[PDB]
Amino acid sequence: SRIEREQHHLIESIEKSTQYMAKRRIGALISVARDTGMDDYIETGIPLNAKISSQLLINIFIPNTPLHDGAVIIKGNEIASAASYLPLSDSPFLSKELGTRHRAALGISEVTDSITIVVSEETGGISLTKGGELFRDVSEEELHKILLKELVTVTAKKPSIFS
Numbered sequence: 001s002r003i004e005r006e007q008h009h010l011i012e013s014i015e016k017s018t019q020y021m022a023k024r025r026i027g028a029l030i031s032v033a034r035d036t037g038m039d040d041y042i043e044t045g046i047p048l049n050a051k052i053s054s055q056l057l058i059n060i061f062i063p064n065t066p067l068h069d070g071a072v073i074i075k076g077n078e079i080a081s082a083a084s085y086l087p088l089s090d091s092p093f094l095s096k097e098l099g100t101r102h103r104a105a106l107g108i109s110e111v112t113d114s115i116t117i118v119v120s121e122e123t124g125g126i127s128l129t130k131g132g133e134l135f136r137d138v139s140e141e142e143l144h145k146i147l148l149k150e151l152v153t154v155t156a157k158k159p160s161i162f163s
């Protein structure tokens with residue numbers, strides 16, 4: 001448990017799972033809690049309290065399965081819940097071409113500092129919401145830089161479990 005290792009593993013787990021789902025046009029909605037709490041939305045889903053892995057993220061979103069219909073919420077170093085409610089944005093600025101997953105990702109971003117990642121089941125495009133804004137159809141490089149900037153808070157320092 002060396003925080004920096006955990007944060008980089010989280011980034012890699014999001015990258016690998018979203019890449020897998022994007023190629024197959026599997027819809028996905030993954031919200032990562034930061035300083036603002038997501039606890040009430042965690043309570044709306046199915047509790048997992050699971051180790052983060054790309055494999056589990058993929059298995060969650062397989063269509064027509066018990067865990068797929070809603071958001072995954074990641075809290076600290078766990079996949080806290082699946083099939084969670086997120087508030088829908090009412091914004092008329094969000095394109096009508098985008099679906100409920102994007103509107104849900106935009107809505108949680110308007111009321112928390114969470115970072116939310118969407119895979120479109122229509123296009124396979126990957127999008128990201130933060131602070132009421134949408135980053136639509138980001139490339140792999142762009143997704144990587146954003147996740148690095150927003151989910152990694154520690155620089156090169158001495159590894160220690162007590163960090």
Ligand SMILES: [Cl-]
Nearest residue numbers: 099120121122
């Ligand atoms: Cl979608």
